[PDB]
Design an enzyme around this catalytic site. Structure first.
Site, short mmCIF file in Angstrom:
data_model
loop_
_atom_site.label_atom_id
_atom_site.label_comp_id
_atom_site.label_asym_id
_atom_site.label_seq_id
_atom_site.Cartn_x
_atom_site.Cartn_y
_atom_site.Cartn_z
N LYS A 56 0.80 -1.24 0.00
CA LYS A 56 0.00 0.00 0.00
C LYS A 56 0.83 1.29 0.00
O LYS A 56 2.05 1.27 -0.11
CB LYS A 56 -0.94 0.03 1.22
N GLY A 87 0.39 4.04 -4.31
CA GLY A 87 -1.03 3.77 -4.31
C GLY A 87 -1.13 2.42 -3.63
O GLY A 87 -0.77 2.28 -2.45
N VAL A 131 -1.30 -2.07 -4.42
CA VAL A 131 -1.22 -3.21 -5.32
C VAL A 131 -1.84 -4.47 -4.71
O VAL A 131 -1.61 -4.78 -3.53
CB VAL A 131 0.23 -3.57 -5.66
CG1 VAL A 131 0.27 -4.65 -6.75
CG2 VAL A 131 0.98 -2.32 -6.08
N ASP A 150 13.14 5.39 -10.08
CA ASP A 150 12.89 4.84 -8.79
C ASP A 150 13.43 3.42 -8.72
O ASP A 150 12.80 2.52 -8.20
CB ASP A 150 11.39 4.89 -8.47
CG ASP A 150 11.12 4.80 -6.98
OD1 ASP A 150 12.08 5.10 -6.20
OD2 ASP A 150 9.98 4.37 -6.61
O1 LIG Z 1 3.56 -3.94 -10.42
C1 LIG Z 1 3.79 -4.50 -9.37
N1 LIG Z 1 4.14 -3.90 -8.24
C2 LIG Z 1 4.15 -2.56 -8.07
C3 LIG Z 1 3.80 -1.65 -9.06
N2 LIG Z 1 3.82 -0.36 -8.77
C4 LIG Z 1 4.15 0.09 -7.54
C5 LIG Z 1 4.49 -0.77 -6.51
C6 LIG Z 1 4.49 -2.12 -6.79
O2 LIG Z 1 4.81 -3.07 -5.84
C7 LIG Z 1 5.02 -2.74 -4.46
C8 LIG Z 1 4.91 -4.01 -3.63
C9 LIG Z 1 6.27 -4.65 -3.76
N3 LIG Z 1 7.14 -3.53 -4.07
C10 LIG Z 1 6.46 -2.27 -4.27
C11 LIG Z 1 3.70 -5.96 -9.27
C12 LIG Z 1 3.38 -6.82 -10.29
S1 LIG Z 1 3.42 -8.35 -9.70
C13 LIG Z 1 3.85 -7.88 -8.10
C14 LIG Z 1 4.06 -8.77 -7.04
C15 LIG Z 1 3.91 -10.12 -7.19
F1 LIG Z 1 3.60 -10.63 -8.39
C16 LIG Z 1 4.13 -10.98 -6.10
C17 LIG Z 1 4.48 -10.49 -4.86
C18 LIG Z 1 4.62 -9.12 -4.70
C19 LIG Z 1 4.41 -8.27 -5.79
F2 LIG Z 1 4.53 -6.94 -5.59
N4 LIG Z 1 3.95 -6.55 -8.10
#
Ligand SMILES: O=C(Nc1cnccc1O[C@H]1CCNC1)c1csc(-c2c(F)cccc2F)n1
Length: 243
Positions: free
Chosen positions: A14, A17, A19, A119
């Site tokens: 969180k 934004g 996810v 980033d």
């Molecule tokens: O786009 C993503 N993530 C993101 C985007 N835009 C902003 C932040 C994002 O993430 C946040 C959570 C993890 N790092 C930052 C994303 C795609 S798949 C994924 C994902 C997964 F497939 C398994 C476990 C954790 C995950 F995050 N994440």
């Protein structure tokens, strides 16, 4: 319509934004759904870098909706690099080289589409643990790439270079490379090198004893205080530690 094609599952994180894990209803493809409040640049940047493939080092955008919600690929199973390191410690130089390599090529790819991520950090590298593969995520704070300097910047401070901290100067390539140096130090040491502004500004490196001198020399290069002393992306790929 959103709630027709996609089912939101658990919260995955969180700033960005927010996810979620989800599924696309029709075929239950696993996806991640990123919610943003207040068309956003991220969709455009993801488009440019995805378009016609585009790259296996970049999480693909699959769909977006207004209500803003982005539907992203979700490799199964996957973990970001920050959590990986938390659980497992530093990667160690053999697998860092490979992952570092992949990140650099993803960045080169992005730059080829005229996109700067801005980033780069270990929270934003997803490790797809089936295929052994790093993927860039979170284009929410990127921009279109130019020679001209920025102050549009809202990155992560600890990955920001001294000339941003000191001068509000953001040069896309040198600042990218700085952040790659942070990331690489992160990967091989298990922590970031500089926690506070003062540490970034002094940029003094004390390597743990386990880091090879090859790895040290490359990281020192990327973390040169003066931005024009820093290597380009090609120099980094040609660095002896990278072979
Ligand atoms: O786009 C993503 N993530 C993101 C985007 N835009 C902003 C932040 C994002 O993430 C946040 C959570 C993890 N790092 C930052 C994303 C795609 S798949 C994924 C994902 C997964 F497939 C398994 C476990 C954790 C995950 F995050 N994440």
């Amino acid at each position: 319509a959103f709630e027709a094609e996609y089912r939101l599952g658990p919260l995955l994180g969180k700033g960005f934004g927010t996810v979620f894990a989800g599924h696309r209803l029709t075929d239950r493809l696993q996806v991640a759904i990123k919610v943003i409040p207040r068309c956003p640049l991220e969709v455009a940047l993801l488009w440019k870098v995805g378009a016609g493939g585009g790259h296996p080092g970049v999480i693909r955008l699959l769909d977006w909706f207004e209500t803003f919600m982005l539907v992203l690929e979700r490799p199964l199973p996957a973990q970001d690099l920050f959590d990986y390191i938390t659980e497992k410690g530093p990667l160690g130089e053999g697998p860092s080289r490979c992952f570092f390599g992949q990140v650099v090529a993803a960045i080169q790819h992005c730059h080829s589409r005229g996109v700067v991520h801005r980033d780069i950090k270990d929270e934003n590298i997803l490790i797809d643990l089936r295929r052994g593969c790093a993927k860039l995520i979170d284009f929410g704070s990127g921009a279109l790439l130019h020679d001209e300097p920025y102050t549009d910047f809202d990155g992560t401070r600890v990955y920001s270079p001294p000339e941003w901290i000191s001068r509000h100067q953001y040069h896309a390539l040198p600042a990218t490379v700085w952040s790659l140096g942070i990331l690489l130090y992160d990967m091989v040491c298990g922590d970031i090198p500089f926690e506070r502004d003062q540490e970034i500004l002094e940029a003094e490196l004390h390597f743990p004893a386990h880091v090879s001198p090859d790895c040290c020399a490359l990281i020192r290069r990327c973390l040169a205080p003066k931005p024009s002393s820093r290597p380009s992306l090609e120099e980094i790929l040609l660095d002896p530690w990278m072979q």
